[PDB]
């Protein structure tokens, strides 16, 4: 058995890439979604007995685990078109601190620098669906994965605020935290390459 | 007068891109190198009266300033070829914690998550030259900008340790911290685009 964590920020396609690859070497292969806010929190419980986390979140040293980049994935800051900040420009791209944000919450209650919300006006949720619902009701703005918002953007339901901050949306790194145990074994090195490849070329 | 900070991690070519662009709008334009470890520390002194910092370092809210991405730049983890970790593989890519690192030091004495060294065996320096000298004498490993190490890598003097962590070297974001003042003024928006462009296409 090889237990595996992908946070909800990882595209569902990546999910297809990994899985295929792993079954080449491994016979029993359990997959687990989690909020990016609960990813590292989860693996840090020994009982949870995770072997491989694929998450966007960062933490420097975690006991028992090693870290590496698999690649990068986009997110966008989004709101209801009519949302005050509709107009995108730089005075808006500091104003966010003043507006209500819909950020992911964490079991841990705590957030990492990467994921801790930016405004003091915050409304916590567990997953990006809860988030985007509330945001479609112009209740706030929020950041969510590219994949989640592709649809709604074309279907004029949602507007982007991010561009004048990071054009092309906000690239963030995808980490593989893995059990030190695996580092030696070629089984993993195999995954890692084959994974990495199909992620970039199709990233 | 427009005062400008580029940390030493920013390529010297970028330096050419910015400068040209700014003089189109601005008549007096002072440029200032700094260690990436002193970049933010500097601008936070009001006396230093900086208008625009181009740095790799991150900090969430800084009073008086706004933040945005200009792009991404590579670094590599390097050592003397004969260095114990020569062989690169995953057991090495946790072993770094155990080896002597040559990290940048800071006037501030303090380091940000991004820049704070990884091993407990550390030797501080001010600039990447000091660093790479010591590293060519296999005294430690260290991370340094792509530009700094291109030469020496081809000239077999230095070996890379990073690949199996982040292949293609370690992409990190380049930030523009800028005086809230500028946000309105088109002069800057101009810089920002024209800058951004020539940085990516030639990144
Ligand atoms: C980074 N990131 C992802 C990346 C990729 C996928 C999911 C997430 C994801 N999901 N949730 C959260 S929590 C919110 C937070 O605190 N971060 C945040 C970071 C950049 C922000 O951009 C701007 C834009 C204009 C002006 C100032 N900042 C705004 C907020 N962050 C996420
Ligand atoms: C990130 N970064 C730059 C980026 C671009 C340009 C300059 C620097 C630059 N200059 N100095 C410093 S200080 C050292 C530190 O604490 N960071 C660090 C970060 C990633 C590391 O990679 C690996 C590799 C294998 C296993 C584990 N980690 C190692 C150390 N960091 C820099």
Residue numbers in the entry:
A (entry chain A), B (entry chain A): 94 to 296
Reproduce text from the manuscript describing this model.
Pseudomonas aeruginosa has three highly interconnected QS systems: two N-acylhomoserine lactone (AHL)-dependent QS systems (the las and rhl systems) and the Pseudomonas Quinolone Signal (pqs) system which relies on alkylquinolone (AQ)-derived autoinducers. The P. aeruginosa pqs system uses the LysR-type transcriptional regulator PqsR (also known as MvfR), to control the expression of the pqsABCDE operon that encodes the enzymes required for the biosynthesis of 4-hydroxy-2-heptylquinoline (HHQ) which, upon the action of the mono-oxygenase PqsH, is converted to 2-heptyl-3-hydroxy-4-quinolone (PQS). PQS and HHQ interact with the C-terminal ligand binding domain of PqsR, resulting in a conformational change that leads to the activation of the pqs operon likely through the interaction of the helix-turn-helix DNA binding domain of this protein with the pqsA promoter. The pqs system is crucial for P. aeruginosa pathogenicity and has been regarded as a promising therapeutic target to alleviate antibiotic-resistant infections.
On the basis that the phenoxy group of M64 formed a π-π stacking interaction with the side chain of Tyr258 and combined with docking studies, it is suggested that introducing a 6-membered heterocycle would lead to enhanced π-π stacking with Tyr258 in the PqsR LBD. The resulting pyridine-2-yloxy analog 40 displayed similar activity compared to M64 at PAO1-L and an enhanced inhibition in PA14 with IC50 values of 0.25 ± 0.12 and 0.34 ± 0.03 μM, respectively. In order to determine the mode of binding of 40 to PqsR, the co-crystal structure with the PqsR LBD was obtained at resolution of 3.2 Å. The ligand-bound complex reveals that the tricyclic head group inserts deeply into the hydrophobic pocket, whilst the thioacetamide linker was positioned in the outer narrow U-shaped channel. In a similar fashion to M64, the sulfur atom on the linker allowed 40 to adopt the required conformation to fit into the binding pocket. The aromatic tail group points outside this pocket and shows a π-π stacking interaction with Tyr258 with a distance of 4.55 Å. Interestingly, compared to the reported crystal structure of M64, compound 40 did not establish a hydrogen bond with Gln194 but instead formed a hydrogen bond with Leu207. In addition, the pyridinyl side chain of compound 40 had an enhanced overlap with Tyr258 compared to the phenyl side chain of M64, which suggests that 40 could have an enhanced π-π stacking interaction with Tyr258. The crystal structure revealed the binding is dominated by the π-π stacking interaction with Tyr258 and the hydrogen bonding interaction between the amide linker of 40 and the side chain of Leu207, similar to that previously reported.
